[PDB]
Amino acid sequence: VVGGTEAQRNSWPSQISLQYRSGSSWAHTCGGTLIRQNWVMTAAHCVDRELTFRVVVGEHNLNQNNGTEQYVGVQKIVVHPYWNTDDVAAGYDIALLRLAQSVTLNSYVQLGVLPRAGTILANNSPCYITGWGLTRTNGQLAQTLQQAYLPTVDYAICSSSSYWGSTVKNSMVCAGGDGVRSGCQGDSGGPLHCLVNGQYAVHGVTSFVSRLGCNVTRKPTVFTRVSAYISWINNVIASN
Ligand SMILES: [Ca+2]
């Protein structure tokens, strides 16, 4: 997250850290959202490689021990059937991970609330992006969870030539674009929390930013619109 601030230890309890085994150590690679005691929602392109993944909940400082973390393995990975590694602009960047064991809920670990299917936010709706991603284009990961105010930019505006144009589909959500704040590599798969009727709900899964940079004016961070996949998500958690 570029241009953000450190978040409160208990501000975003549904945020998780997806890490892969690097030799004999673990390295953070993406964010995600706990939607069930044993199910995590994240980005498909985050789990395209055949690596060994683990999920960390109750996490705040990636480098230190907060005394609130729970480490659990990933038993099964369910990528959306239409995902295409070579075409992130085609959409469908979403995946579900069944954890090896159910986690215990508390002040630091809670489930994220998903919006009703088909829900579309009005232009300039108040949302926040959170993550341990890069704090600068070509910089380094953050040590502590960061957050940044990132209002939405409706489809009509985001798909106009002055912004992302045709690269953006109606199955996506755009937020930010002020050239100062934005998501960055490492925030992918993480949530976009938006205030709706006095409650924060996860409306997006961080998907991509500009090849030319993370914080680029008129090039808002692009997210997978969660409300477009509610039926899919429910069918997976019920079957698998
Ligand atoms: Ca820690």
Swiss-Prot record:
BP GO annotations: proteolysis
Domain of life of the source: Eukaryota
Alphabetized UniProt keyword annotations: Calcium, Disulfide bond, Hydrolase, Metal-binding, Protease, Secreted, Serine protease, Signal, Zymogen
Pfam families cross-referenced by the UniProt entry: Trypsin
Disulphides: 30-46, 127-194, 158-174, 184-214
Family membership: Belongs to the peptidase S1 family. Elastase subfamily.
The name this protein goes by in its record: Chymotrypsin-like elastase family member 1
